[PDB]
Design an enzyme around this catalytic site. Structure first.
Site, mmCIF file in Angstrom:
data_model
loop_
_atom_site.group_PDB
_atom_site.id
_atom_site.type_symbol
_atom_site.label_atom_id
_atom_site.label_comp_id
_atom_site.label_asym_id
_atom_site.label_seq_id
_atom_site.Cartn_x
_atom_site.Cartn_y
_atom_site.Cartn_z
ATOM 1 C CG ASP A 25 -22.979 81.819 14.078
ATOM 2 O OD1 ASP A 25 -22.310 80.794 13.961
ATOM 3 O OD2 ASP A 25 -22.622 82.793 14.762
ATOM 4 C CB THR A 26 -23.824 75.995 11.932
ATOM 5 O OG1 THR A 26 -22.474 76.176 11.522
ATOM 6 C CG2 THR A 26 -24.742 76.016 10.727
ATOM 7 N N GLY A 27 -22.412 77.830 14.422
ATOM 8 C CA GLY A 27 -21.618 77.877 15.607
ATOM 9 C C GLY A 27 -22.276 78.475 16.841
#
Lengths: 99, 99
Positions: A25-27
């Protein structure tokens, strides 16, 4: 690996002598895993903020392994609907977004 | 581009004749942008679910541009603390995770 994004980027990870499923999850700034016993001294951390906070236990310098690659960093342990591999661990893995 | 993850992957995007800042988020299924007028027929969509739902307006076949690359797909318009580029648009951009 090279992971396309047509499905959720769920991976198997090794952590704490267990195997867990988690989302790349880059968020997410941080890595959050539910229900794992980890060594060392933890301290409480409040995460979230949008709508409220959740208390979790912060463990530092934990080793995880994903797709044969080890990474060391902070793991937050507490309730989460999906286990999250956040940027603190993605950076240690040398993971980039490419397009 | 090749984007490392030591900071949040915020990008400038072109959408609807405007420029917006948004987060490249592999953890998000959908693309959500606040405060933009878009063409076509929309329909309400309930998103979230963890703790509750938020109503947004779903617009299909919208063109966005990021780092010189165009992508066409659904954009949900509604309140969001950060504008999100989710997997539906990341796939159209040909974006992968690599490590």
């Amino acid at each position: 690996p090279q992971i396309t994004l047509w499905k959720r980027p769920l991976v198997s990870i090794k952590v704490g002598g267990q195997i867990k499923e988690a989302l790349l999850d880059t968020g997410a700034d941080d890595t959050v895993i539910e229900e794992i016993a980890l060594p060392g001294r933890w301290k409480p951390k409040m995460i979230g903020g949008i709508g409220g906070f959740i208390k979790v236990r912060q463990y530092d310098q934990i080793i995880i392994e994903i797709c044969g690659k080890k990474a060391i960093g902070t793991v937050l342990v507490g309730p989460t609907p999906v286990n999250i591999i956040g940027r603190n661990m993605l950076t240690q893995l040398g993971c980039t977004l490419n397009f």
